[PDB]
Amino acid sequence: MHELTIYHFMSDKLNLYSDIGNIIALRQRAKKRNIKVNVVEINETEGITFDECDIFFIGGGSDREQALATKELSKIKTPLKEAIEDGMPGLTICGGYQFLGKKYITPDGTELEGLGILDFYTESKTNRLTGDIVIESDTFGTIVGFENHGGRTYHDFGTLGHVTFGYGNNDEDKKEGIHYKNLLGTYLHGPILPKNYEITDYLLEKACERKGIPFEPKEIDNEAEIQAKQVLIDRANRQKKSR
Ligand SMILES: NC(=O)CC[C@H](N)C(=O)O
């Protein structure tokens, strides 16, 4: 009978690729381990600290929305960075992932400043990396979703895994997302992303380990999620190879 506190950043501003689905899923799977989740809605960051944070989330918005969210988050750049370097778990989606970096470059070459928490950048083209995506991850097992991004992200940090169907971060790497200490970032989004329950359980497991509370039962029924993932895996295995 225990509790975790979740920091939910800029939900009001980041509507294009909302992380709400993942927070709902986090709550569901935590409840199955007798853990109640306390969600803190943070849209203004002055005075924010991370001593009481167990997991954080940043979703994705339009370029305009993400810039605004980034400007507000920059007020707590140093505490957020220190939390991440300390091992704080978190999940970031699309723009929320991209703007952890130094910059985001539009197709016409306009440079938008990122938070600069990690040394990487993203450049966009008008033609997007689009389609079903299947990833084999040493940590997360099979990850499935849908990608649809003009952004090409270039970084040298950990990744969520090898892409066996689709593109991932960019046209060539066949790797998706970022995995930096316990911080996760991905171009995957929407209703399918939460079906990847191992991502959710990773965040919970790491937060429980850090806090010093049990995460039991570790194994629960995942039949529905496995079935949902398999629909996408089967479809990808039947399609043209993505070149
Ligand atoms: N899907 C997106 O990237 C935003 C909306 C989309 N570009 C459209 O034309 O409707």
Residue numbers in the entry: 1 to 243
Question: What does the paper behind this entry write?
Answer:
Recently, MurT and GatD enzymes were identified as responsible for catalyzing glutamate amidation in S. aureus PG stem peptides. Moreover, in vitro experiments showed that the MurT-GatD complex catalyzes glutamate amidation of lipid II using L-glutamine as a direct amine donor, when ATP and Mg2+ were present. GatD shows high sequence homology to the glutaminase domain of glutamine amidotransferase (GATase) enzymes, in particular to cobyric acid synthase, which is involved in cobalamin biosynthesis.
